Subunit: 181 residues, 4 copies
């Protein structure tokens, strides 16, 4: 109730998230019943969603994580990013499931998707909590989507504003007074 002061609107409630997580986890568990997928999230934003989704995914799976950084101009036009932490294990022959917080332009995510394909993954799919198709600067459709949202000015449940608000249990929109700081 302390950080809710700064939230103008609760876009996706905790109750909604946990309901959708249960639905998606069961779907994913059924689709991957015949393989042991490698579920990977990109730090930092996807961590809260990845924790909830996977522990409601009742099937055998492995986890891993990547960390990336922007190259600046090149990242905004092509999605190319600097690998700060590569996967612990090889991608070849694995069924990859990328767990993402939001897809807006989709440039960086497309860059990583096709990188894993270059590394000869058996398959690559995406489950994203939020989808903003309005902002696509490349053709990328997620295979599982939690909620479609109109804009990217969202915080909470992993999403930050200047590294804060990631620890909200829901997705919200900040009061404009926050952007003045």
């Amino acid at each position: 109730a302390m950080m809710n002061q700064d939230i103008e609107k609760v876009l996706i409630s905790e109750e909604q998230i946990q309901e959708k997580v249960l639905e998606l986890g069961a779907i994913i568990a059924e689709d991957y019943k015949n393989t042991v997928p490698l579920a990977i999230g990109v730090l930092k934003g996807a961590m809260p969603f990845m924790a909830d989704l996977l522990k409601r995914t009742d099937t055998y799976l492995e986890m891993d994580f990547m960390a990336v950084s922007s190259y600046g101009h090149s990242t905004v036009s092509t999605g190319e990013v600097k690998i700060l932490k590569d996967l612990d294990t090889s991608v070849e022959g694995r069924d990859i499931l990328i767990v993402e917080d939001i897809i807006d332009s989709g440039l960086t995510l497309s860059y990583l998707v096709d990188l894993f394909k270059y590394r000869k993954a058996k398959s690559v799919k995406i489950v994203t909590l939020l989808d903003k198709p309005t902002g696509r600067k490349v053709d990328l459709k997620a295979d599982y989507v939690g909620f479609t949202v109109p804009h990217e000015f969202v915080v909470g449940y992993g999403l930050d504003y200047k590294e804060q608000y990631r620890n909200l249990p829901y997705v919200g929109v900040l009061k404009p007074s926050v952007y003045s700081n």
Copy 2:
């Protein structure tokens, strides 16, 4: 593919975890009243606990993550580990909170604690879900402890056996038959 069938005992149930998470989160929010701490998790095991704990910690805070790997013999004796992913931001002058899944020998965690102190952190504290004090090979006491356990043969809620079972919503103990595989 219900994973419960491999579990011999639910050591710490999901209900217990969420109960303890609410307790700790409120204690931590009060203790870090007058600062913006940097909450740090070491991949991979602390990810589910860090997600739950921080979203029940009603205060301003920043998140970050580290990745480390064993050097072999040296890691088992001194706790020295290879840094694969360093913190995104500097440690100097920050109040560091390390979120851990379990403390057993405590060597690697003690190595990281005194590394942050070498990097001139203002303070360094530890919250761990599980504590196995009978395994200490070094003097190290966590400042926040979820539960005390007798041994380290546990899986679930981030903890793995051969990279599996991290996605259980609870902490359990495997049937011996799975050790035979």
Copy 3:
């Protein structure tokens, strides 16, 4: 105990190496006269050759380095490796010159070449000091080659055996008694 006592014979002497780096540097300086290329070395073995080669290439260029680790089976069969140190700058649109100590199997090197192509490099070329065509496990030809050699268990000038001998100023054949 000295390192030369472990060398059976010299394959390429220091003098011959410096003659070759002088030749290669002049060619590279000519081919890259109208661009600022990104000369990339993969640690650790390419470091001695990359140092000597580039200070004999009288032209504007920039350096960078990558560090990688093996994934085990995938690395030995497809060349896929774990990136520990990615380039400090974006590959898009750059003329990449990979500086290599030796091309034997060529798997990992080919993986990195087509990785830079996936990252939309303007061009990707390789200069290697040594070339063992007999070792290939993938089709890969260097653009600049110092020496083509038959199979010998060589060390020196960046090439190691168990992390030692990299600091020899020449390339020598290791005594079989060392690597039984």
Copy 4:
């Protein structure tokens, strides 16, 4: 358009460097004859000096490298840096020799030195080609030094301006027109 056009003066010729490098190699070879040291370079500037120095050090040794990034304020005030590539092996008990191109403020080098001590290195020593001891922002004395130099804006032999000039075989003073 050639690089020497941008050089106002040659501060340390290639001949001078190699004579001193030869001299440093023999001292280090003697001092470390009874141990296998871990020679560490921090990318990228130390690479040309490290290559020449180590191939003039006739003794058994291993090489490794570290890659670091600046954190901004903390780096220029305490030397704390972001580890991108850590060492490939444990520091505990090793005799560490850090090969450096130049020590000016010494902040980051001092941070890494005491990091290796915290990691229980048996010994940590430094060999630098150049030393500006008047630029120190921390008490740091190099164990081996090539040339002691006043305050100049130098490039070459690993030292860059905006990632260029690293491949000069000599150390030169950059024309003021260039960097302005």
